[PDB]
Each structure stands twice: as C-alpha cells, then as structure tokens.
Amino acid sequence: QPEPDMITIFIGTWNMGNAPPPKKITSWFLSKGQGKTRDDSADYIPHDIYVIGTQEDPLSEKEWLEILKHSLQEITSVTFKTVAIHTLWNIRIVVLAKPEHENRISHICTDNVKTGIANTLGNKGAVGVSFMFNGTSLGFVNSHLTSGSEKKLRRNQNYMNILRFLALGDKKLSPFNITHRFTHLFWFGDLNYRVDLPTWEAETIIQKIKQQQYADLLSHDQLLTERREQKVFLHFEEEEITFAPTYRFERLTRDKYAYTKQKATGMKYNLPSWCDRVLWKSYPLVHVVCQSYGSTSDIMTSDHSPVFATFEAGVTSQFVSKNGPGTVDSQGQIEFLRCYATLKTKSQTKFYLEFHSSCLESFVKSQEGENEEGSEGELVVKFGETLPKLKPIISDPEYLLDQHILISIKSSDSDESYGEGCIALRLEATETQLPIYTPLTHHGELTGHFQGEIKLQTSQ
Numbered sequence: 272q273p274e275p276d277m278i279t280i281f282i283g284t285w286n287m288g289n290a291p292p293p294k295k296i297t298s299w300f301l302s303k304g305q306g307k308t309r310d311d312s313a314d315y316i317p318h319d320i321y322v323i324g325t326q327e328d329p330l331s332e333k334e335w336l337e338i339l340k341h342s343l344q345e346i347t348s349v350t351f352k353t354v355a356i357h358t359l360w361n362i363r364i365v366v367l368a369k370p371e372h373e374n375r376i377s378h379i380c381t382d383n384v385k386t387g388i389a390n391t392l393g394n395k396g397a398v399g400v401s402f403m404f405n406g407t408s409l410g411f412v413n414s415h416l417t418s419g420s421e422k423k424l425r426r427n428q429n430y431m432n433i434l435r436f437l438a439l440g441d442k443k444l445s446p447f448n449i450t451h452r453f454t455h456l457f458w459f460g461d462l463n464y465r466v467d468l469p470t471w472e473a474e475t476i477i478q479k480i481k482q483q484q485y486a487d488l489l490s491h492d493q494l495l496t497e498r499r500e501q502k503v504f505l506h507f508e509e510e511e512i513t514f515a516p517t518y519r520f521e522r523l524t525r526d527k528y529a530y531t532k533q534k535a536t537g538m539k540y541n542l543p544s545w546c547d548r549v550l551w552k553s554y555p556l557v558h559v560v561c562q563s564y565g566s567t568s569d570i571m572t573s574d575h576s577p578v579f580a581t582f583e584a585g586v587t588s589q590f591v592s593k594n595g596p597g598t599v600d601s602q603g604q605i606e607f608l609r610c611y612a613t614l615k616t617k618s619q620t621k622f623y624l625e626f627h628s629s630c631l632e633s634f635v636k637s638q639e640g641e642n643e644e645g646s647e648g649e650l651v652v653k654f655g656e657t658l659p660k661l662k663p664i665i666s667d668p669e670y671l672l673d674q675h676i677l678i679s680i681k682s683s684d685s686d687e688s689y690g691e692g693c694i695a696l697r698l699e700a701t702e703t704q705l706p707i708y709t710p711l712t713h714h715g716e717l718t719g720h721f722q723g724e725i726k727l728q729t730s731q
C-alpha cells in the first residue's frame with residue numbers, strides 16, 4: 272500500500288441561517304451548482320479529507336455529524352472517520368477523512384478565537400483544526416466575521432485577531448502565527464465582505480446576477496478590493512468567482528435576493544454579496560490546485576447558499592533513513608550567502624534570525640546582523656556570510672528538496688519577532704548558489720523582506 276504524494280481536500284462553508292438543513296445536501300459535497308463545478312464522472316470518487324465549516328448552525332454536533340456521514344456514505348459508499356469537530360457558539364468545523372487515512376493523521380489540534388470587545392464579543396469569531404497528514408501539516412480555519420457593508424475594517428481586524436490568537440499546529444514554532452505553521456492553510460467561512468455599490472443600485476445588481484455578468488459586481492467586492500490594497504489576507508489565494516452572490520436569498524427558493532432594510536436587519540441593506548468564501552495559503556512550490564469553487568443551487572433552507580471548493584494538495588511521506596530521525600545526516604547541509612533583511616521598522620535594536628524546520632532537530636539562532644540605512648530610509652540588516660550552516664536530519668534529496676525553512680527576524684533587546692517568512696528547498700540545483708527570497712510579515716502584515724542566496728547539499 273504506497274503512501275500518497277497527492278490528496279484531494281473538500282472545503283465547505285455554509286451559513287445555515289439558524290435553520291435545519293434539507294433532507295438532501297449531497298450537491299454540496301459533489302461540487303454541483305454554479306461556478307467552477309466538479310465533473311459528473313468524479314461523483315463516486317471520495318475526497319481524502321472533507322472539511323465542513325458552518326455558521327449560524329442550529330444543530331448539535333451529534334445531529335450534524337450524522338447528516339454529514341450519511342451524506343458522504345450515500346455519495347461514496349465510504350464510512351468516513353471523524354478527525355475533529357469544534358464549535359464556538361454557532362460556528363462549527365468538522366473534519367472527516369477516509370478510513371485508510373486514520374494512521375496517517377496525527378497531532379490533531381482544535382482552537383477558537385472570539386472577536387470583538389463587550390458590545391462586539393458574543394457571537395463572531397473562528398474555529399480551527401490542524402493535523403499532520405504523514406509529513407504534511409494541514410490547517411483549517413472557519414471564521415464568521417463581523418456583518419454589515421460599512422464594517423469592512425472590523426472584518427480586517429477580526430482576521431488579524433484570528434490569525435494572531437488561533438493556537439493551531441506546532442507550538443514549538445513560537446515566532447510563527449497560523450499563516451506560517453502549515454504546508455497548506457485553508458481559511459473559509461462567512462467572511463461577510465459585501466459588494467460595495469450604492470443601495471439605489473440593488474435592482475441593477477440583481478439584473479446583472481440574472482445575466483451571470485459578475486465582472487462589475489466583483490470589481491466592488493470588498494474582500495477582492497481589500498486584498499488588492501493589502502489590507503487583509505496578505506499572501507492568500509482565492510480561485511476566480513464564477514458563481515452568483517451567495518447572500519442574501521429569500522428562504523425556500525433561490526429566485527429572489529432579499530436586500531431591503533428591515534427591523535430584523537437593524538435597518539441595514541444586504542445588497543447581494545459573496546459573503547461565503549474559501550481562501551488558501553500553501554508554502555512556496557508546494558502543489559495546490561483548486562479543482563472546484565462554486566455554490567449549490569438546490570439547498571435553500573438558509574438565506575445563504577453553501578459554497579464548495581476542492582483542492583489537489585501535495586503531501587509528503589513520513590520519511591525514515593538509517594540516520595534521521597534521531598540524528599543528523601552529515602551528508603546534508605543548508606548554507607546562506609549574502610543574506611539581508613530589509614525591515615520597515617522605525618526602531619534601532621540589533622536583530623538575529625531563527626531558522627525553524629521539521630528537517631532540523633531543533634530551531635537555530637543566528638548571530639546578530641549588522642544594521643545599515645537603505646537609500647530610501649529603510650533598515651537593512653546584513654548577515655553577509657555569517658549565518659550558520661544548517662544540519663538537516665535527513666540528506667536524501669527526495670526528502671530534503673520537499674522541505675521548507677521558516678525564518679523569524681528577532682530583536683536582540685526583546686526577543687520579539689519583527690518578521691516571519693518561509694523559504695522552499697525545492698531548488699533548481701544542489702551544491703549551487705541560488706537566489707532565495709521571502710516577504711516578511713508580522714501579525715500577517717508586511718514588515719520587510721529577506722533575500723540572499725542558498726547552497727543546498729544533499730546525499731546526491
């Protein structure tokens with residue numbers, strides 16, 4: 272039984288509008304409806320992992336698990352195993368996997384973050400799951416962000432609180448937030464970003480949706496515009512949206528958008544919007560391909576339609592040599608040449624680096640770099656040729672070229688990270704000086720850059 276080098280992952284997000292689901296929700300798991308949909312010929316082929324995010328979910332965990340498992344069994348004839356289930360208020364995440372994966376999945380973590388203070392703390396936030404799948408770390412975030420067309424800034428704040436405080440993955444990666452802890456990170460939910468057009472244009476928007484002419488609406492989608500201006504979800508991907516806005520429908524049909532202000536909406540308009548989204552971020556040069564992104568047409572119990580996305584995701588095997596794990600493989604080394612960090616910080620402290628990777632026995636601290644002034648005001652931290660030689664646990668190129676080095680630049684004064692990034696070892700050549708680059712972020716905001724050269728020695 273060979274270990275996989277690819278798996279397929281289903282991501283579902285559905286704001287259920289505090290209503291039980293209908294008797295059949297199989298179209299969701301089959302990626303059928305509007306948008307980028309799955310080929311009929313694949314219907315019986317199970318995904319390896321199904322990750323279901325709900326919001327405004329009125330069901331018990333037990334009730335929803337029974338519906339999900341019975342749904343997948345009907346589609347696939349496979350009895351899926353429950354990896355994890357976590358609920359915060361009415362925000363839920365379920366992870367189901369094929370039974371053959373039970374002994375490939377380990378280090379299962381769950382957490383939640385509650386967003387807002389006093390007034391604004393009570394029902395919005397995120398749940399998350401992480402685990403190892405063989406040698407690959409996978410994280411999944413289901414967030415219900417602040418509602419309302421005029422709260423895009425609040426949503427961006429909710430995003431930053433969730434990525435700062437959601438405690439998933441390897442706690443030894445202390446400088447790193449969830450946006451660096453995983454080979455593949457999927458973030459989905461009712462993100463609640465709106466199509467930002469005048470209220471008077473509601474009927475015009477509806478007309479455009481009936482014509483399947485989304486271009487003039489997506490150009491006002493607050494998530495696309497905020498992402499384009501690097502206000503939120505920096506370094507995340509989203510597939511092109513080719514399905515109608517998933518909010519706000521009249522229940523029991525999909526023929527009508529209910530957008531007019533009502534006491535029940537706090538006298539707010541709900542112009543048709545793409546509230547319900549799936550984004551991802553994978554480490555550099557790892558295979559990840561979106562194979563569906565759409566909405567169902569036949570599930571109408573909520574004022575939202577379910578959204579599906581599916582992915583091919585590269586995975587690696589749990590590598591064992593004669594040497595590592597449990598020693599170094601002297602045949603292997605990672606060297607850094609001519610490296611420097613460019614930082615946006617206005618501070619003057621000394622900086623050092625930390626290198627973190629599961630290819631190392633433990634993280635490595637550099638000596639301090641030498642600060643200089645950039646020509647446009649910047650702080651440049653020069654490491655020259657002073658960075659340590661990293662000793663990986665396994666030298667085999669089939670393992671080592673699949674690995675990544677996380678970098679944090681830390682203040683010597685405070686040991687606080689000013690920036691985090693990631694470097695792929697999937698090089699064009701070994702034993703060859705090659706340029707490397709990563710942007711550096713902190714709390715998911717751009718704080719600088721790290722660039723230089725790498726020289727990777729494998730046992731080949």
Ligand SMILES: C[C@H](O)CNCc1c(Cl)cccc1Cl
Nearest residue numbers: 495498499500504506507508
């Ligand atoms: C590799 C990714 O495609 C980068 N995405 C950046 C981006 C955003 Cl986030 C929004 C609008 C346009 C663009 Cl290029």
